[PDB]
Design a protein around this ligand. Structure first.
Ligand SMILES: *[C@@]1(Cl)=[C]C2=C([C]=C1S([N])(=O)=O)S(=O)(=O)[N][C]([C]1[C][C]3[C][C]1[C]=[C]3)[N]2
Ligand SMILES: NS(=O)(=O)c1cc2c(cc1Cl)N[C@H]([C@H]1C[C@H]3C=C[C@@H]1C3)NS2(=O)=O
Lengths: 50, 51, 50, 51
């Protein structure tokens, strides 16, 4: 964008101050903030003689 | 894998353009229109839950 | 704003596209949506067979 | 009285000025500073959850 090689960013692209300093961003379309990915702790399982 | 809890922050995606490019306002108007037309949520449904 | 009675709007005046035809909205400070308010459900005696 | 159902659409608020007013750009630049500082949610905590 800042090097003029391509014209528009329809993309999974974060709006941030440290980016809008040099480029423009539109209004954002949806809220999608940070979360922590964990692996699931295996799975629950009923037992034949639980 | 599971997402723990909710959103940690207000981080969000918007459409970006070189600064001062005339694409800005019409793209904004279109993307805003899509929110009231439901197209954005319809796409989100398709791409996460229909699939 | 349109008729010069004020210099800036700072309120829960919701973004709408038709309003931005005559004013400029900034980036949002948070997301929210349309919702319904009713009198809340009560807590009361379970069934006879409970 | 209580909330029922989910929110219908991806909408939000915005600070607004007369069209072309000089305030819009410093306001917008301010918002992206306030967001990473956590002020925007801290105020929400102060005005919903702390009350
Ligand atoms: C915060 Cl901290 C900031 C913003 C929103 C929501 C929150 S939170 N985690 O719910 O309190 S917002 O209203 O969803 N919109 C955002 C925009 C600001 C900026 C552009 C968009 C994303 C960065 N502010
Ligand atoms: N329901 S969602 O997660 O896909 C989602 C997230 C967002 C949407 C719209 C949707 Cl549908 N647009 C909002 C903006 C659009 C317009 C309306 C509010 C703001 C202006 N910001 S957002 O938070 O970036």
């Amino acid at each position: 964008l800042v090097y003029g090689k391509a014209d528009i960013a329809i993309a999974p692209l974060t709006i941030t101050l440290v980016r809008e300093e040099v480029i423009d961003f539109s209004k954002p379309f949806m809220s999608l903030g940070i979360s922590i990915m964990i692996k699931k702790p295996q799975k629950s399982k009923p037992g034949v003689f639980s | 894998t599971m997402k723990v809890g909710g959103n940690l922050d207000s981080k969000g995606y918007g459409i970006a353009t070189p600064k001062g490019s005339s694409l800005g306002t019409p793209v904004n108007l279109a993307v805003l229109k899509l929110s009231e037309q439901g197209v954005l949520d319809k796409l989100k449904n398709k791409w996460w839950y229909d699939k």
